[PDB]
Structures are given as structure tokens and as C-alpha cells.
Design a protein around this ligand. Structure first.
Ligand SMILES: [K+]
Ligand SMILES: [K+]
Ligand SMILES: [K+]
Ligand SMILES: [K+]
Ligand SMILES: [K+]
Ligand SMILES: [K+]
Ligand SMILES: [K+]
Ligand SMILES: [K+]
Ligand SMILES: [K+]
Ligand SMILES: [K+]
Ligand SMILES: [Mg+2]
Ligand SMILES: [Mg+2]
Ligand SMILES: [Mg+2]
Ligand SMILES: [Mg+2]
Ligand SMILES: [Mg+2]
Ligand SMILES: [Mg+2]
Ligand SMILES: [Mg+2]
Ligand SMILES: [Mg+2]
Ligand SMILES: [Mg+2]
Ligand SMILES: [Mg+2]
Ligand SMILES: [Mg+2]
Ligand SMILES: [Mg+2]
Ligand SMILES: [Mg+2]
Ligand SMILES: [Mg+2]
Ligand SMILES: [Mg+2]
Ligand SMILES: [Mg+2]
Ligand SMILES: [Mg+2]
Ligand SMILES: [Mg+2]
Ligand SMILES: [Mg+2]
Ligand SMILES: [Mg+2]
Ligand SMILES: [Mg+2]
Ligand SMILES: [Mg+2]
Ligand SMILES: [Mg+2]
Ligand SMILES: [Mg+2]
Ligand SMILES: [Mg+2]
Ligand SMILES: [Mg+2]
Ligand SMILES: [Mg+2]
Ligand SMILES: [Zn+2]
Lengths: 111, 147, 101, 53, 49, 118
RNA sequence: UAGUGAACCAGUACCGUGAGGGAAAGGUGAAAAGCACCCCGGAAGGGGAGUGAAAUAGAUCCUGAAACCGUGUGCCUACAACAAGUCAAAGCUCGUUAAUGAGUGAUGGCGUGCCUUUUGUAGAAUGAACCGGCGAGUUACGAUUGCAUGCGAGGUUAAGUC
RNA sequence: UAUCCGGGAGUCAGACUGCGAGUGAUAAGAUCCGUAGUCGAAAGGGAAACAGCCCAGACCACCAGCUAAGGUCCCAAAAUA
RNA sequence: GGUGUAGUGGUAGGAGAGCGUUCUAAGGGCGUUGAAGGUCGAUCGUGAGGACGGCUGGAGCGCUUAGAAGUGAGAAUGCCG
């Protein structure tokens, strides 16, 4: 009741590259996390920003918590389903390509 | 029953001994000193813990080298660069840096592990008869009968 | 006060009120047992047995019989496609020491 | 040349020790108070050095 | 007799020995055939006599 | 009568892995590496249950030697004297006396010295 | 991964000029009652609110293993040479199928994987990237020996008919 | 323990060490026999490490004792006997 | 069942006795008051292995005796994922 979470599943992005941005914001005030994501140029910053803003919207609308006091209690990225692709290579042979996806989760608590 | 005593770090009191190296053969001085540093002289000896005592070796410059060791016993060391072999005689080391002579001899006899290196650090060698460790109230350790 | 007794081909140090584990004794639980081979008795004074202290004995009560944690003997020789596994639980008798003479 | 042995999880994590992002140069914008990058125009109010631009 | 208490005569029935089912059985790996050679092959062996 | 793999395989491999709990990385995670390590663990354990007795007798001897020297005697002389004096206290108990009951150890040493003199 | 190659729009997709070769792929729930409405978002996807016995049964839907990836942390680790364990062990943490408990582990001793093939392999000889599944002395008809049973100088039916 | 009768095999690449020979050069961790051991198929202790050498054959448990080869100044148990 | 004596390294391999898997028969049981399966635990046996609890799971499954086998995987530059 004191925490709200949001999740974006099967988002097309590298889990490792996403975890870079997630590590930046983990365990930080919501305002600080928003600023960091806004000024981080990496692709996953925008994705994580929407998830964090969605989580904050949950904390406020669904559970009527205190936005100012909200902090990022927990955040992580989980591997999603991998789309399989192939790329032709020299001498009539192909090589597999893993088009990865990520499950981005953000949990924000009152304090 | 599994009742054998095992010393704990910090419970055993390490004393301070003064060993006079005057005319004592280098190896025999090193052997007795190494036993003391390891703590083999005390019943509370526990192989996996340090229980030996500190040693202050004085008059290192007067240590005895029997036979022609003074000029023929050679200490080698390789810089690890090709052809980087250096040599220095035991006699020259005694004359110039006798502390290193005693320390090298004792290092060879202590165990070659973390505990052994820590036990070595408790050794203090001083060519000459005076040392700065009077604050530790060290007591003389006659070794005439031990060698 | 304490004593050293010869039990199970082994020597044990015993004090009144201290339980000791020994090789299985052919005695029912809760029964009295006397160790007559007291090779030393110490305390304020010392008694030295040559090999045993004359007319000194230790008395105890058999608290329990039990089995020590299992030990697995697994013997194999590499590259010889041959192994053998064995289990063991050594029986023991726990005795509370009541009196030392 | 090819790896002789596969890299373990511990060694892989050790190597990635330094493979991290960083964020630097953020402080409150004078005009609007929003966090901005120092020496950059504030993306929110479009002010720099106290003037709209 | 009772269908739930059947008992064969002692020594009347034995258990089939299965080879190549682990070392401890004594017939693992080589399955009692030994090491290499003609007799160690599937369908190996020479004609009688 | 088809008998599919079932669960015996998983059960057996999980037993091995539980034995391998605490090992380093793959040596506790993967069955093949785990089994290989557990086998070496068995070999070392059987070997060490014999080396253990050697080590502790060695430890007792060293401690008894130190105590005997403090009493003016070498370990070899002390044990020879004790055998002459008929004392059967073993090295475990002797080491215990040396560390804890120095007075009792001195009494034993005096008897050994007396026997040697005779 | 069985059973037809094919439990499903299979001789299909796909491959080949052609003959020809030839797959993968079953399971929501009792019943769609398949999430009205609200909130974040362009959407996707989520959080509420509902349906339901159950939604961590939400359609990639029964169960949901391992490899692999990640978050949190009780203990340890930046003077150390390590087939990674085993034996010994202080300290710290915890409290069980209550057992002379559990986790971790400073430090000390010992210690060159598994398999195959070899006189001999830690081997700088071979095999295994890891995990899961599948994967190798069987059946028929004869021969012979042991064991067992029935009968016993006897023993026994085969085809075939009911 | 030997025979004998029958069911079931595997083995037909051996190695080194000591001793007696051949071949070799009175070379070889060479080769070929005879002979005994060990390894092979044998862990443990010693020989620094070291299948074949020395001691010795692991059904198990013990934080008990005595010895073999080999050792007792320190690493490292035991004589600065 | 007891005592005593002796013995219990082992490759190729021979003999013996067992564990576990699926199914059949009979008997006797267990299951929406939660089966199988999964996971965790400091549990038991000489071994393969057997229970017992917590959680998950949601419908079948043990046990005794006997019977039949597509009956046990860690390796095949094995096949598939
Ligand atoms: K055979
Ligand atoms: K479900
Ligand atoms: K962890
Ligand atoms: K270690
Ligand atoms: K090769
Ligand atoms: K027959
Ligand atoms: K025969
Ligand atoms: K010979
Ligand atoms: K369970
Ligand atoms: K394989
Ligand atoms: Mg082309
Ligand atoms: Mg049959
Ligand atoms: Mg065999
Ligand atoms: Mg095999
Ligand atoms: Mg083969
Ligand atoms: Mg051959
Ligand atoms: Mg053959
Ligand atoms: Mg299988
Ligand atoms: Mg012994
Ligand atoms: Mg098919
Ligand atoms: Mg569930
Ligand atoms: Mg599911
Ligand atoms: Mg250093
Ligand atoms: Mg450090
Ligand atoms: Mg060869
Ligand atoms: Mg390879
Ligand atoms: Mg496999
Ligand atoms: Mg030769
Ligand atoms: Mg062979
Ligand atoms: Mg050997
Ligand atoms: Mg070998
Ligand atoms: Mg002796
Ligand atoms: Mg010594
Ligand atoms: Mg002398
Ligand atoms: Mg034996
Ligand atoms: Mg079943
Ligand atoms: Mg099969
Ligand atoms: Zn601004």
C-alpha cells in the first residue's frame, strides 16, 4: 500500500545497456531520477523514464501516496523473449542474430 | 573428544627477546631465532596462528661465517630481465648490510606463506650493540646452549 | 579436580558433572558404570599412575547410546572405471561423570 | 585467435567493473529551478545565464 | 494359492543379466566383451570350427 | 512397455549438486563439474580422515617438546623416561597438561627425570 | 523429441532446374465469465477496479525443472601464485527432521580434473561450451549347460477340431 | 590345496628394477631371452617432485599406542645425542 | 542367534545379492480436508537409494506379492531444443 510499481515487458532494447541506466537511478529520489534520465542520452533512458513516470502515476492515482517523498526503492531489468534472426555472411553461410528484449521494472515507495 | 587446545589470535602474549650474534655461526643463530619467531618454544604453539615472540638481533656485524663462506658463499638474485643475475658474497653483505644477511638467512627458514611472512616481520636485526626498542622491555635470550 | 581415564583404547579427561562420549559400552542407558583404569588424577594435588593410580576409580551414568554423523567412504581409481561407496555411523555412549575417587 | 577457455561469470563481471555509465554536470537552473547541465541552455525554460534564448 | 500371495518354487526363475548398465554391475562399458578385437564387434566372431 | 526417462535422472543429479553446495561457481552449479568435484572431495576426505590422526599427533608432540624444554628436557628424553617410569599417559593428554596444567606436567617431567637417572 | 513424416490446414512450409528431400508446431478456465470503467503512455505495456475457487490460470495462458540473466544481502575478500577441494580452524551471522546444529570463513596442512586409449596420461595424446530430453546385447527359431517342476523305463504331443 | 568333469570368460602391444646371457660399441629409458620382484590391476610412508626403486598390501570409525624403509638445526615430527 | 579363528586393494573378467523406473494381475489402501509433479530442509539405510515436514501444484497415486520390459547416461567431433 506504501509502494507502487510499473513494468514494461518485451521492450526492444539490450538488457545490459538498459541495466546501465537502471544502475544510475536505483535508490534515488524520484525528482533526481527523473532529471538523470532526462539528461542521459542513451536509448534506454527514455524507456525507463516512461516506466518511472508510470510508476509514479500509479503511486499517486491508485494509492494516493506522497509524490514528493517518493523514492526509487527497487528497479531492475529482466531478460525478455529473444527474437531470432539471421544475417548472411561470406561464403554462403548465415550467422544467428539475437534481437533482445527487456522487462523493465521500477518500484517506488513512500520513503 | 576434540579437546585439543587451539590458540586464538590476540590471546597469547608475545614477548621480546634480545639475541647477541657475536661469533655465533650465521645458520645456527638463524635456526634458533626462527624457532622463537614461529613460537615452537612455547606449549601454546598452534600451527595456523602466530604465537611466537619478537626478536631483536644485535651485533649482526659480528656474526660468524665458518670456513671460506665469507668470500665463497654467494647470494644470487635475478632481476627477471635477461642476463639480470646479480651476486654478492656473504662477507660483503656482513660488512656493509648485515641486517640483510641475517634477514635472508631467517627468511629461508620460516614458512613460505602468509603466516611465515608475518612472523618474519617480528624480526629486528641491528649491526652493533644498541637498538631503539627499549620501550618494549626486551629480555636477553642466551643461546650458547641452544646452538 | 579432574581425572584421566583409559576408555575405548583411548584416554579421556573427566570432571564431575561433565558428559563424555566414548566407544559403545555394553551397558543399558541410565545405568552406572565404573572406570577402574585411572592413569592420572589432578586438581589441587596430582596423582600419577605407573601405569595406573592404585585404588582410584571414576563413576558415571550412561546417559545415552547413539550414532555419530554418517561418514561416507567412496573409493575410486581414475580411468579404471571402478568405484565403491560405503557408509558408516560409529556407535557412541555418552556418560555423565558422577564421582571421581 | 579464439578463446582457449570460456570466460567465467566472475571474470566477466570483473571485466565489466569499469563498463558503467555516468552522469555529470547537473545542477539547478537559476531561472526555473529545474535540473540542467552546467554551461548548457536549460531545456525547460530555455534560459542561460539568466536570459531567455 | 491366492493371486496376491504367489510364490515361485525356489530356484525356478532367475533375473536376466543386463550388460552395459554401469560399471558397478561388472558388465558396464565393454559389456563383458573385453577390449577391441574382432570378438568385441557387433556381429563379431568367427564361424564355428 | 515404454519406460520414458521420468524423474530418477533429476533426483540423482540433484543429490550430487546438494553435496556440491558451497563450491566455486560452476563447481556447485553444473552437474558434470559438480560430480567431478564431489568425487575428488570423497577422495580427499578419505585420505584426510587418515592424515588427520597424523597431524594431531604431530601437534601434540611439538607442544610436548616445548613444555619438556621449559622443564629442562627434550621430548625424546621425556618419553624415554616416562616409558621407564611406566607412565602410559598418551600424547594427547600430555599436550593438554602442558598447555593447561603446567604443574601436573612438571610432576610428570620430574618422574621421567628420576627414572632416567636410575 | 514418443506414436504415422504428419494428433495442429503435412507430404504443407522450406530446399532443389528436376527426379527428389522434407520440418516445426497439442493443453486458459467448469463455464469466456477473454479484464466494463479509471490512471501513466503515441502505442506497446503496466497499476488499480472487476470476472473467476484460483489471474504468479490474462490468451507467449495447466504444471513451469536446469542451463542462462538479474535484484536484495548474512559472512568473506584489494601482499596474493588458487584441478578450487579436503582436513584443522578464530571470528561473525543464524536457530534445525534438536542433531556431540546450520551459513560463512581469516589462517594452516595435504592435494596436477572426468573419460577414452595405453607399458605408461595432470597430461603438451582423445572427447565433452553448458543445461534438458532422446540415445547402444533385443526378439524369433534352433543348439547346449545349470537351476526348477511334472512324470519316470519312460517322457511328450505337432498340425488340426471345439 | 591338487586332479578330473562341465558352464562362463578375458588375455596373444607389456614396462621397468635386480641377477645370468646374446645382439649393440661389455652405448641407449636400446633390443632379445632366462630368472625374481613391482607396476600393469596397489592406495599409504621414504626417495624434493618422480607407474616399475626402498618399506608396505586401504572392509570401516577414533583428536589412542608401537614400529618398517627413511630420519631427528629451521622449512618439517623427532638427538644442536 | 552366540562365541571363536581367519579373511574383506583391484583392471579384463566370472559368480552372488540387491536398489530404482514404467506397465499387468490380485489384495489392501491414499486423494479438492489437496494425488502426481516442482522446490526447500540440519532426515534414514552399508550402496543403489527410502521417508517425513514447509511451500508450489490442481487430479490422479502409493504399498504387499507375483509377472513383463522400449528399465537406469556423462562422455559416441552423438541427434534435437
Ligand atoms: K564375457
Ligand atoms: K494456474
Ligand atoms: K548472490
Ligand atoms: K585450503
Ligand atoms: K593431436
Ligand atoms: K533347460
Ligand atoms: K574351466
Ligand atoms: K629382466
Ligand atoms: K515435499
Ligand atoms: K554429448
Ligand atoms: Mg552467395
Ligand atoms: Mg525373463
Ligand atoms: Mg570387472
Ligand atoms: Mg563410462
Ligand atoms: Mg572401447
Ligand atoms: Mg589390443
Ligand atoms: Mg578380445
Ligand atoms: Mg534419459
Ligand atoms: Mg598411524
Ligand atoms: Mg517428425
Ligand atoms: Mg502458481
Ligand atoms: Mg504456465
Ligand atoms: Mg610482500
Ligand atoms: Mg589482505
Ligand atoms: Mg605410446
Ligand atoms: Mg574438444
Ligand atoms: Mg547432453
Ligand atoms: Mg625397453
Ligand atoms: Mg592394459
Ligand atoms: Mg604406490
Ligand atoms: Mg595411473
Ligand atoms: Mg616410538
Ligand atoms: Mg622439529
Ligand atoms: Mg651435536
Ligand atoms: Mg586389505
Ligand atoms: Mg506416473
Ligand atoms: Mg533405454
Ligand atoms: Zn531553467
Amino acid at each position: 500500500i506504501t509502494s507502487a510499481k510499473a513494468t514494461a515487458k518485451t521492450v526492444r532494447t539490450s538488457p545490459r545497456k538498459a541495466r546501465l541506466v537502471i544502475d544510475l537511478i536505483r535508490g534515488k529520489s524520484v525528482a533526481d531520477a527523473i532529471s538523470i534520465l532526462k539528461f542521459t542520452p542513451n536509448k534506454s533512458a527514455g524507456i525507463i523514464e516512461k516506466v518511472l513516470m508510470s510508476a509514479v502515476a500509479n503511486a499517486e492515482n491508485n494509492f494516493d501516496l506522497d509524490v514528493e517523498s517518493l523514492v526509487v526503492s527497487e528497479a531492475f531489468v529482466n531478460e525478455g523473449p529473444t527474437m531470432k534472426r539471421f544475417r548472411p555472411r561470406a561464403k554462403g553461410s548465415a550467422s544467428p542474430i539475437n534481437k533482445r528484449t527487456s522487462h523493465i521494472t521500477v518500484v517506488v515507495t513512500e520513503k | 573428544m576434540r579437546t585439543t587446545y587451539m590458540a586464538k589470535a590476540g590471546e597469547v602474549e608475545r614477548k621480546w627477546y634480545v639475541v647477541d650474534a657475536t661469533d655465533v655461526p650465521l645458520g645456527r643463530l638463524s635456526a634458533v631465532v626462527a624457532s622463537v619467531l614461529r613460537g615452537k618454544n612455547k606449549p601454546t604453539f598452534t600451527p595456523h596462528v602466530d604465537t611466537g615472540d619478537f626478536v631483536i638481533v644485535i651485533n649482526a656485524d659480528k656474526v660468524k661465517l665458518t670456513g671460506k663462506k665469507a668470500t665463497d658463499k654467494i647470494y644470487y638474485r635475478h632481476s627477471m630481465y635477461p642476463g639480470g643475475l646479480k651476486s654478492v658474497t656473504a662477507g660483503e653483505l656482513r660488512d656493509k648490510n648485515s641486517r640483510r644477511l641475517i634477514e635472508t638467512s631467517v627468511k629461508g627458514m620460516l614458512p613460505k606463506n602468509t603466516l611465515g611472512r608475518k612472523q618474519f616481520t617480528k624480526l629486528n636485526v641491528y649491526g652493533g650493540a644498541e637498538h631503539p626498542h627499549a620501550a618494549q622491555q626486551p629480555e636477553v635470550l642466551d643461546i650458547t646452549n641452544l646452538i | 579436580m579432574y581425572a584421566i581415564i583409559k576408555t575405548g583404547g583411548k584416554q579421556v579427561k573427566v570432571e564431575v558433572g561433565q558428559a563424555i562420549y566414548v566407544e559403545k559400552l555394553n551397558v543399558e542407558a541410565g545405568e552406572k558404570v565404573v572406570f577402574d583404569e585411572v592413569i592420572l588424577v589432578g586438581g589441587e594435588s596430582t596423582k600419577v599412575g605407573a601405569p595406573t593410580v592404585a585404588g582410584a576409580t571414576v563413576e558415571g551414568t550412561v546417559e545415552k547410546h547413539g550414532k555419530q554423523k554418517k561418514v561416507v567412504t567412496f573409493q575410486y581409481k581414475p580411468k579404471k572405471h571402478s568405484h565403491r561407496k560405503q557408509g558408516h555411523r560409529q556407535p557412541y555412549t555418552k556418560v555423565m561423570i558422577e564421582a571421581i575417587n | 585467435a579464439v578463446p582457449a577457455r570460456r570466460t567465467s561469470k566472475a571474470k566477466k563481471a570483473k571485466r565489466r567493473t569499469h563498463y558503467k555509465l555516468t552522469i555529470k554536470g547537473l545542477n539547478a537552473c537559476s531561472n526555473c529551478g529545474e535540473m540542467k547541465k552546467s554551461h548548457h541552455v536549460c531545456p525547460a525554460c530555455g534560459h542561460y545565464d539568466g536570459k531567455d534564448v | 494359492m491366492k493371486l496376491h500371495e504367489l510364490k515361485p518354487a525356489e530356484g525356478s526363475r532367475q533375473v536376466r543379466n543386463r550388460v552395459g548398465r554401469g560399471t558397478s554391475s561388472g558388465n558396464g562399458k565393454t559389456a563383458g566383451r573385453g577390449q577391441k578385437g574382432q570378438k568385441a564387434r557387433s556381429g563379431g566372431g568367427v564361424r564355428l570350427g | 512397455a515404454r519406460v520414458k526417462g521420468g524423474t530418477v535422472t533429476r533426483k540423482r543429479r540433484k543429490k550430487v549438486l546438494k553435496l556440491a553446495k558451497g563450491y566455486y561457481g560452476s563447481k556447485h552449479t553444473l552437474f558434470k563439474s559438480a560430480k567431478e568435484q564431489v568425487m575428488n572431495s570423497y577422495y580427499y576426505a578419505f585420505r584426510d580422515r587418515r592424515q588427520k590422526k597424523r597431524d594431531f599427533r604431530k601437534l601434540w608432540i611439538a607442544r610436548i617438546n616445548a613444555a619438556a624444554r621449559m622443564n629442562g628436557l627434550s621430548y625424546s628424553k621425556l618419553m624415554h623416561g616416562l616409558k621407564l617410569a611406566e607412565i602410559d599417559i598418551n600424547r594427547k593428554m600430555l599436550a593438554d597438561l602442558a598447555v593447561n596444567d603446567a604443574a601436573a606436567f612438571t610432576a610428570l617431567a620430574e618422574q621421567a627425570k628420576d627414572a632416567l637417572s636410575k
